[PDB]
Amino acid sequence: DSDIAFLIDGSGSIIPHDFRRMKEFVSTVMEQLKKSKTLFSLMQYSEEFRIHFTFKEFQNNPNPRSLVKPITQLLGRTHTATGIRKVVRELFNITNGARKNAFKILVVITDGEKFGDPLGYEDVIPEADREGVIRYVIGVGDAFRSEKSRQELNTIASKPPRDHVFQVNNFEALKTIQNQLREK
Ligand SMILES: [Mg+2]
CA-CA distance, 181 to 107, in Å (whole number)? Predict the structure, then answer.
């Protein structure tokens, strides 16, 4: 009943240690929320976009660590807003394996520093809301240590943001999110 997409920040500001943390987080979530009728898809972004595995692909090889291990960091700039628009139109596309009727959940993993993107969040969130995409945000690095980045996470997250924003090293986030997914 659920199509859960990951939008992971692979921009150069993301330190290698943190990008690995992202991959570890993604893998654990997929292994945890592994519910028979739950598919996953992942797109990495910088100024470029890489769909690592579509829902159809996951459906063909539902092995998280197999799908995640090969992922290499793109580096470059941080076009988070464009990434969100592309996720909504591309990952949640039936030709990519996305299912009609299914709940749409997007997990954005970033340090909260959008940079270079011609789009602002104001240009993309209304569309995500209209297509029913529930948004969780996982902050890495110094995301929670600046006024700007904290608010960026809040802007991307569905409301109330406090219930949808988590720190990547809060290992208890996954079960909290899992608990919340029973209340979609
Ligand atoms: Mg960046």
Answer: 12
Q: Output the CA 114–ligand 1 centroid distance in Å.
A: 6
CATH number at residue 10: 3.40.50.410
The method of structure determination was: X-ray
Count of the separate structural domains present in the chain:
1
Q: Cα 156 vs. chain centroid, distance in angstroms?
A: 11
Question: What's the rounded Cα separation, in Å, for the pair 136 and 6?
Answer: 10
CA of 144 to the centre of ligand 1 (A): 15
Strand order in the sheet with 103-110: 49-53, 38-45, 2-9, 103-110, 133-139, 165-167
Instruction: State which residues form the domain around 124.
Output: 1-184
Give me ligand 1 centre to Cα 29, in Å. 23
What is d(CA 22, CA 42) in angstroms, rounded to the nearest whole number? Answer: 12
